[PDB]
Every structure is written in C-alpha cells, then in structure tokens.
Write an enzyme that holds these catalytic residues in place. Sequence first.
Site, PDB file in Angstrom:
ATOM      1  N   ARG A  54       0.876  -1.156   0.000  1.00 52.21           N
ATOM      2  CA  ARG A  54       0.000   0.000   0.000  1.00 52.21           C
ATOM      3  C   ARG A  54       0.911   1.201   0.000  1.00 52.21           C
ATOM      4  O   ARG A  54       1.619   1.448   0.973  1.00 52.21           O
ATOM      5  CB  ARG A  54      -0.890   0.006   1.219  1.00 52.21           C
ATOM      6  CG  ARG A  54      -1.773   1.197   1.285  1.00 52.21           C
ATOM      7  CD  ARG A  54      -2.201   1.443   2.680  1.00 52.21           C
ATOM      8  NE  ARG A  54      -3.204   2.486   2.750  1.00 52.21           N
ATOM      9  CZ  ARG A  54      -3.584   3.054   3.876  1.00 52.21           C
ATOM     10  NH1 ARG A  54      -2.993   2.770   5.018  1.00 52.21           N
ATOM     11  NH2 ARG A  54      -4.573   3.933   3.852  1.00 52.21           N
ATOM     12  N   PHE A  59       2.106  10.645   0.634  1.00 52.98           N
ATOM     13  CA  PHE A  59       1.602  10.240   1.933  1.00 52.98           C
ATOM     14  C   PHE A  59       2.591   9.291   2.576  1.00 52.98           C
ATOM     15  O   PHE A  59       3.354   9.692   3.455  1.00 52.98           O
ATOM     16  CB  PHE A  59       0.219   9.629   1.773  1.00 52.98           C
ATOM     17  CG  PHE A  59      -0.388   9.145   3.043  1.00 52.98           C
ATOM     18  CD1 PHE A  59       0.081   9.544   4.277  1.00 52.98           C
ATOM     19  CD2 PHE A  59      -1.448   8.271   2.997  1.00 52.98           C
ATOM     20  CE1 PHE A  59      -0.503   9.070   5.431  1.00 52.98           C
ATOM     21  CE2 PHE A  59      -2.023   7.790   4.133  1.00 52.98           C
ATOM     22  CZ  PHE A  59      -1.557   8.192   5.357  1.00 52.98           C
ATOM     23  N   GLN A  62       3.572   1.721   2.803  1.00 51.18           N
ATOM     24  CA  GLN A  62       3.202   0.804   3.860  1.00 51.18           C
ATOM     25  C   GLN A  62       3.561  -0.616   3.477  1.00 51.18           C
ATOM     26  O   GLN A  62       3.370  -1.040   2.340  1.00 51.18           O
ATOM     27  CB  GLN A  62       1.727   0.894   4.147  1.00 51.18           C
ATOM     28  CG  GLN A  62       1.259  -0.059   5.202  1.00 51.18           C
ATOM     29  CD  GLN A  62      -0.125   0.272   5.672  1.00 51.18           C
ATOM     30  OE1 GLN A  62      -0.600   1.378   5.499  1.00 51.18           O
ATOM     31  NE2 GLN A  62      -0.778  -0.683   6.287  1.00 51.18           N
ATOM     32  N   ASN A 101      -1.988   0.462  11.837  1.00 51.04           N
ATOM     33  CA  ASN A 101      -2.824  -0.221  12.799  1.00 51.04           C
ATOM     34  C   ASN A 101      -4.240  -0.237  12.284  1.00 51.04           C
ATOM     35  O   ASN A 101      -4.552   0.340  11.245  1.00 51.04           O
ATOM     36  CB  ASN A 101      -2.692   0.409  14.183  1.00 51.04           C
ATOM     37  CG  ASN A 101      -3.241   1.797  14.253  1.00 51.04           C
ATOM     38  OD1 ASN A 101      -4.340   2.070  13.797  1.00 51.04           O
ATOM     39  ND2 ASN A 101      -2.475   2.694  14.842  1.00 51.04           N
ATOM     40  N   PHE A 112       4.647   1.893   8.181  1.00 51.07           N
ATOM     41  CA  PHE A 112       4.717   2.761   7.037  1.00 51.07           C
ATOM     42  C   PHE A 112       5.843   3.745   7.229  1.00 51.07           C
ATOM     43  O   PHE A 112       6.263   4.052   8.342  1.00 51.07           O
ATOM     44  CB  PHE A 112       3.400   3.466   6.744  1.00 51.07           C
ATOM     45  CG  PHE A 112       2.880   4.293   7.866  1.00 51.07           C
ATOM     46  CD1 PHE A 112       2.224   3.702   8.926  1.00 51.07           C
ATOM     47  CD2 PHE A 112       2.985   5.667   7.834  1.00 51.07           C
ATOM     48  CE1 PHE A 112       1.701   4.465   9.942  1.00 51.07           C
ATOM     49  CE2 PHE A 112       2.464   6.440   8.851  1.00 51.07           C
ATOM     50  CZ  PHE A 112       1.828   5.836   9.908  1.00 51.07           C
ATOM     51  N   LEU A 121      -1.841  11.779  12.028  1.00 45.09           N
ATOM     52  CA  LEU A 121      -1.600  10.464  12.581  1.00 45.09           C
ATOM     53  C   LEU A 121      -0.981  10.528  13.959  1.00 45.09           C
ATOM     54  O   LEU A 121      -0.903   9.502  14.632  1.00 45.09           O
ATOM     55  CB  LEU A 121      -0.700   9.675  11.640  1.00 45.09           C
ATOM     56  CG  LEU A 121      -1.287   9.525  10.235  1.00 45.09           C
ATOM     57  CD1 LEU A 121      -0.329   8.709   9.393  1.00 45.09           C
ATOM     58  CD2 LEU A 121      -2.663   8.881  10.266  1.00 45.09           C
ATOM     59  N   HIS A 125      -0.951   6.665  15.532  1.00 43.39           N
ATOM     60  CA  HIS A 125       0.014   5.678  15.109  1.00 43.39           C
ATOM     61  C   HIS A 125       1.282   5.904  15.872  1.00 43.39           C
ATOM     62  O   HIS A 125       1.700   7.041  16.077  1.00 43.39           O
ATOM     63  CB  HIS A 125       0.283   5.779  13.630  1.00 43.39           C
ATOM     64  CG  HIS A 125      -0.917   5.442  12.829  1.00 43.39           C
ATOM     65  ND1 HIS A 125      -1.117   4.192  12.303  1.00 43.39           N
ATOM     66  CD2 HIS A 125      -2.033   6.151  12.555  1.00 43.39           C
ATOM     67  CE1 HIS A 125      -2.284   4.159  11.688  1.00 43.39           C
ATOM     68  NE2 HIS A 125      -2.866   5.331  11.839  1.00 43.39           N
TER      69      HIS A 125
END
Length: 164
Positions: A54, A59, A62, A101, A112, A121, A125
């Site tokens: 991902r 951004f 991941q 998560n 990530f 985040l 995270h």
Amino acid sequence: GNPLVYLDVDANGKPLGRVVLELKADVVPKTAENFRALCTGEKGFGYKGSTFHRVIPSFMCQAGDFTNHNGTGGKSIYGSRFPDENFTLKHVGPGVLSMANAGPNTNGSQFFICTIKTDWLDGKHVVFGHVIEGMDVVKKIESFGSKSGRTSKKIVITDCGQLS
Ligand SMILES: Cc1c(C(=O)Nc2ccc(N)cc2)cnc2cc(=O)[nH]n12
C-alpha cells in the site's frame, strides 16, 4: 544505541537499494524491538520477502504484512497484536517510520514510512523510527504507489536485518 535496521527493496524484481531505519528504542523500546526482530527474522518470521503493498504518493509507503501480503495481516513478535506503546514521537515529516494499525492497540507488523508530514496520525500511530539512509529508495517506492494505495510495481523487501 538505538537499532539500525535495513530493508533492501526490489521493485519488479530489480533492486532499488536499501532503506536504513533507526528504531527509537529509547522512546518505544517494545515497538522498536518488534520491528528489529522482524527485520532480522530471528523469531522465525518477519519482513523478508514481504511487500510494500500500500503506497500512496505524497503520503506514505506501507509494508509489513508478511502473513497475508495484502494489508489484513502481519503479527508481532509478542503475539498477533500489541498495544500502542506511546505517541511521543510525531509524524514530523518524510522518513518517519510508524506503525500501521487497525485502531488503538492493534500494532502487529505493518508499518509505514511517511513521505510527508502526516500530523493527523499523531496520537493514532506509534512512530518508532525514521529513515537514516535511503530516502531515495523510499521516493522510488512512493512513485510506484497510487491514490488507492495499489502499487504499480511489485515492491518486495528482499532482505532485511539489523546493522547495529
Ligand atoms: C488501512 C490499511 C491497512 C492497515 O493499516 N491494516 C492493518 C494495520 C495493522 C494491523 N495490525 C492490521 C491491519 C493495510 N493495507 C491497506 C490498504 C488500504 O487501501 N488500506 N489499508
């Protein structure tokens, strides 16, 4: 000192190079230790051979679902999931290494690497390290992402381990 670990990353079977990550065991020892051991594979499982599944340009990238290779899986060295250790380190910019998560206290193995500051985040995270070297590799990985997170190349952590 804090562990330095590495991910050697292929895209479509050709090496992009190495991402070296400092794991901030001084802040999040349990989270750092999980990642460290998943890099070395010393528990008998870990990131070797798993993918960045991902990747979202501008951004993050991941990876770490070494059980299902699709974002649903992964496991920690402690058990399937482990708590959010703390949120002290912040998603301050590109190169931040943070645990993916599925809600509070669902850290497993997925993680990530941010390619931008992702301040929203913070508190959600667990940040546990950052890129020491290889942001160029991260930018390559990022460039193979898409808005949906689907990668346009198969991005594989072919090797990983601990440098110190
Ligand atoms: C939100 C998300 C995740 C994710 O973070 N999943 C997750 C993280 C940690 C644990 N322990 C279990 C599951 C993984 N892949 C994808 C693809 C996608 O479009 N969204 N997505």
